[PDB]
Amino acid sequence: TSARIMSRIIKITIIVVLVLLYGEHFGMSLSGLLTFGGIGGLAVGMAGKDILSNFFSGIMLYFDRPFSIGDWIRSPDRNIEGTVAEIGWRITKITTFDNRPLYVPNSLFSSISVENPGRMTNRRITTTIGLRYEDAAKVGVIVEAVREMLKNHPAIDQRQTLLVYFNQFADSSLNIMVYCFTKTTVWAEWLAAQQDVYLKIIDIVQSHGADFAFPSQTLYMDN
Amino acid sequence: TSARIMSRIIKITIIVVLVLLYGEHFGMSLSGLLTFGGIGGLAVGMAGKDILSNFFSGIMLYFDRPFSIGDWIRSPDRNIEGTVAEIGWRITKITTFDNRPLYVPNSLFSSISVENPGRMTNRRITTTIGLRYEDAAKVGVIVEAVREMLKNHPAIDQRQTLLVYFNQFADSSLNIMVYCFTKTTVWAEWLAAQQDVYLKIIDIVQSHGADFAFPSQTLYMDN
Amino acid sequence: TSARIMSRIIKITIIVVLVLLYGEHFGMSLSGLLTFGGIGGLAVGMAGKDILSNFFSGIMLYFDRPFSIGDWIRSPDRNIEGTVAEIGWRITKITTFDNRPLYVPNSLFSSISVENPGRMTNRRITTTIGLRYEDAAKVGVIVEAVREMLKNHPAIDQRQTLLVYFNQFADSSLNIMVYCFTKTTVWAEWLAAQQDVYLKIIDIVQSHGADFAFPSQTLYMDN
Amino acid sequence: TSARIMSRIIKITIIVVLVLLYGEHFGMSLSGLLTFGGIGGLAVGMAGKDILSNFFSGIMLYFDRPFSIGDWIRSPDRNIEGTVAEIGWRITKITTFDNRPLYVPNSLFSSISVENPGRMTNRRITTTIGLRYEDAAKVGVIVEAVREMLKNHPAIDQRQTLLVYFNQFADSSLNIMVYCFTKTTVWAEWLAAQQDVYLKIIDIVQSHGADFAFPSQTLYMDN
Amino acid sequence: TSARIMSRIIKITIIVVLVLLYGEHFGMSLSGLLTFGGIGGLAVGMAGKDILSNFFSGIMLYFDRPFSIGDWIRSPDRNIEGTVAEIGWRITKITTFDNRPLYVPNSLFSSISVENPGRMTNRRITTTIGLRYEDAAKVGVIVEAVREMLKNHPAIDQRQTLLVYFNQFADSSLNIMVYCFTKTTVWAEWLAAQQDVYLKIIDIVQSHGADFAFPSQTLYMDN
Amino acid sequence: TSARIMSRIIKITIIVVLVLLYGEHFGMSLSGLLTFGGIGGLAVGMAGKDILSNFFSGIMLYFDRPFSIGDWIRSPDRNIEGTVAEIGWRITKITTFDNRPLYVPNSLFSSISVENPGRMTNRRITTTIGLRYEDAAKVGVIVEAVREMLKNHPAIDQRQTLLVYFNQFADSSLNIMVYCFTKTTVWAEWLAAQQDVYLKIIDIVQSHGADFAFPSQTLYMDN
Amino acid sequence: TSARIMSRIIKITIIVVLVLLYGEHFGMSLSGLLTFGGIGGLAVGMAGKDILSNFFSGIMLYFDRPFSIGDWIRSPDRNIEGTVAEIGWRITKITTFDNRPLYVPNSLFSSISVENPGRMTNRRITTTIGLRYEDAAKVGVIVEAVREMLKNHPAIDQRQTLLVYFNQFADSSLNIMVYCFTKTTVWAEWLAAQQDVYLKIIDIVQSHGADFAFPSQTLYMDN
């Protein structure tokens, strides 16, 4: 389709060949060549940017790929997520978890940090608890029961980092940092462990009479 | 219309021809040519930017189009949304859902991620529930009834990813992550499924006596 | 007025002519020409930017105008709004709705998305409702009465997109997405329809005993 | 004052003249000229920026001034406000409403939108009302009384845009958009009209028993 | 101290002289000169930036100083405040009100707006009042008593701008814009006037029974 | 695999060799060489940026490494954290605490501040207390008991900085700045000390009857 | 260690020497030299930036150091704080108050404001009080008692700036600006004075029956 389009590509090529042959035949004068000549390199230079660089930068990715099709590639910087679909020079298909294919320009991968959880070894499960000041005396023991359970639980990696401590003193709460790592990377398996853990842990704070806490205030009144 | 306008286009062309002929005839001296000559390439170089690059970058889009007229093209980066209308070198018409035609310069597509949900396979329906701590013991069973229903429902894709779990422990709530995918991409059909699902799910939490929850506080008072 | 001003314009012109004639007469030595010569093109190059580019970029706008005097031109990016007044190379007058004339430099139009609602086909009326959880069982029917009315109403375009659904589950509410399009673009006519619609709709939620909702909380107290 | 200062300006000038004369006399060799020569144009080129461009860009302002001494020049972009004081090439004095003279570099005017309300035709008076849901049935009539008054009032321009409508449905309120334009631009006159209008309008909502509204909540309690 | 340091400065100078003399003596071949030669100008060009520009830009400041030692120089843009201490080419000492000397690079003054309140003519005293809706009928008179007092007060400049009006309708309040200018620039004198004014004004709202207002709400409850 | 790929690398190399040999054989004319010639250096120049610079900048890191494999490298600027994994020219592997390997481009290390807590000497434990105004008279003594304990405690470094003071007056509280340093850098050991300290400190405020505080308000009511 | 590494540094040096000797021997043709030649200067030019500039900019710091080892150097701009450790060309060690050594690239010091409180003359102690509207009549006297004490106190510098005034009218409070300067810069001494001052001041507001204030509201209720 489209005459003018197909035409004008021949055109911007042919005249690079014409200037070349004209300064080799006549071009009297030689002087004006170099000059005209420079606007091509400079204008292509400031019209170039990413639109040209995508190909080099894509090739650099071709020498080695930090991400490899079968992985999802969160980036803290730019907002791109979900599994890497297919790799191409001008673009890079990438399915998101909403199954919409975002076409990422390749030059972006040149700059941003590009962690891929797809190559995970583990899933960190991080939580927080938070027990009323009323529960304050019993903090030492409740923490310990929770500390003990995680070791004995099958799902979590005992060898891996496993800290539970009074930690923060924050706000209206007494937040307690659960921090431990699950085995399986895979989504349903880890989530299921997490549910099992919160169900167990939730009971323990219930079990000793320490009560879970919500933001709370101190109203003052007149008579 | 307009003499000065029509005039001044002849002008910036004719003098490119005059410099060319002058350095071929006289121009004595040759030396001053190259020099004058360079301000053209440099000034066009720093007056060029996007205003020149739009055409190259549009052509690059002409070699392949990630978006293809019949689609809407959300971009997480820049704020442009709604169906792609017509494609042009200096611009790109694009109807928004408010039916206002935003004329996007083409150079922008060179940089930003440009997912198009128009080429969706599915609609993810993501929700959250959130049940009082009062409902805490019954969490395991309510979750399961909800877990069971989604599988049996006709609208959702059972084969596709389908997670429901206790997940977060957040705030004054016990948020539960519904996450499943509908069949039809199309707007009224999916929304109707969503309404059917929330109506069903809303009943289940009602049905077991677990109560939906709102932000809550702990007032303290004097006598 | 002003000698020094009028003087110094002659000056920065005349010496471009003097350098030209001096290197054609003497300038011995030729060597130092090219060199001096380059600081002009480079300094004009890095003192140029927008201050020079406004004219090219304005001309590009002269070849075709996405906005055409009789229209108002919101831009999601830069903060400029209101009807386009008059178009000029260094600037572009533009009345705002507060009737203050903002003089927009033309180079800006080169980059930002420039939707103009002035070329609207419709006005989307988007609302939200939000009914207490108390109203929860009756959600299916209230929605339907509202769904029915919009079709029958004369003001809205029935052919055009028209969705009403339970949609969100958010917060302390049960928000319901009204979404439909009015005929007339023009400001008083559409607003009047909107008032008629909200007055009608407001009654319906009132009519079935479902109550409109406001942020709500759950106070807890001591004895 | 200051020998070293006065000295070193002669110095960076004289040696531009020495290099010029040296390559015209000896400079054996010619080759090294051009080279040394280029660091001047390039270093002045990347040490130049705004510090050089202020003068060109100021001159461009001298060809035409969108702002003209007797006016105040808000800019949505950069934070500069208040009456324009005096215009100068390196700077531009500008009194602010706190009577502190901010010296704006001229290059800034090259980029930012520079509306000047000083050349206003009118003052838009925009308000909002907001009536309890309790007042909901009477909304149609209260609006009309308010609608009627503005037309009859002497201060507002009846010919000019004049919309009052139920508009928003927002939050805990029923906000009503007053929007009309005063005659006089000048500060005390318009403000006085505004006071007269709010005093009149405030009564009307009072007059029909509709009550003005404040953020409100729905406390829930135990026994 | 330090041989290697003192040594390596001689070094990067001497070899600029060696290349110059070598291409004037031998350098067979001339061709490679210009080339090597260019990396110096370009690398100094992209290693230059501010680190070189500070001196030019400082000199520009030396031709005229908008700020003059004995003044404090708030900038809306960059965060620098407090009295200007001493002026130097690479830097500019500047005491802050916390008496910590921040060394500002001079190039910054090239770009940012640099108002100096030190050259003030006045101090604007801006306040806000805000009277319960309960006080609403009496707004006209309370405002007037306040309006009258400011004129009669010795401290404020009566000739200078002096507006008091109902202004805003905002929130839970009825905010009233006091706006007037004090005589003395100097810190203790103006503050003392401000205290005298607020003490006087505070009484007037007290005096008519209008009550000052705080954010307020509308609790709703069950039985 | 892939013919076109393997092919096109030969191609962009071979023609650099062809242009070189062609201008050495024919190339008639010499003039057009330099010109064509420049577009290569300029286009590689504006397609280069980081994609080329990563290697130089990586080498600079190779001369000396502020971070050394066995350390974690928080950066206040860019969001990268966790232990440094392996170092490579195009990238730098880096495990995060979630065990996901983020591949950092090396050029980034050139700009951002890169503190590594891995080379810590200590752990600062910073807290805050905050005692009701009710506790106000006893502030001097409670502070002292807390001041005394930290000195006597084995875990904290007494020699190191150790301030405890009334400090802030903020909000509804009387915040007290605990600030002291633990011995062991290592994660479980320090956290355990922190738990021991907060448990001890929590008792002291309890012990004197001063009560810990939460945000509090002053309700006002009608009859 | 590492053959390939050690090898490839020889390599990128040796071929700069080979091109030089080749165009001096053959290089037939001379023409292609200059051209190839330029890609080196340009690519080093756009791969250079900070990675090259760190050394120049470090040297500039070597000519004079605004910060001098024994000082801590807060910067309002970039987030770097704490005592300056050691100074080096590629970097600058700097201990933070958490005793983690952040390695700052030197080029940063070229741009940002770099106040160093280490060279303080004083410590400003700034506070705020805030007394219920209930305390309003007594504001004049309480302020004066506080005004008097600071003069008589030994710790504060009476000669130095010393303002106390009703100042703000803000919010639910009547905030009073204490502002005075302590003698000793050093951390424990000044903090101790601050504690002594707040303890004294706290009593005075207590002493006259004015009560310290917290955010407060006005609940409204039904029957």
Author numbering:
A (entry chain G), B (entry chain F), C (entry chain E), D (entry chain D), E (entry chain C), F (entry chain A), ...: 113 to 335
What's in the article?
Mechanosensitive channel of small conductance (MscS) has an indispensable role in the protection of bacterial cells when the cells experience a transfer from a high osmolarity medium to a low osmolarity environment. In the present study, we characterize a Na+/K+ cation-selective MS channel, YnaI, which exhibits small conductance among the family of MS channels in E. coli.
The heptamer extends ~117 Å parallel to the sevenfold axis, with ~87 Å in width in the perpendicular direction. Secondary structure analysis predicts that YnaI contains five TM helices, while we only identified two transmembrane helices (TMH4 and TMH5) in each YnaI protomer, which may be due to the flexibility of the other three TMHs. Consistent with other MscS channels, YnaI contains a large cytoplasmic domain and comprises the middle β-domain, α/β domain, and a C-terminal extension forming an interior chamber of about 30 Å in diameter. These structural observations suggest that YnaI structure was resolved at a non-conducting state. Indeed, YnaIM158A in the TM region alters the mean reversal potential from −39.2 ± 0.5 mV to −20 ± 0.5 mV, corresponding to decreased cation-to-anion (PK:PCl) permeability ratio from 9:1 to 3:1.
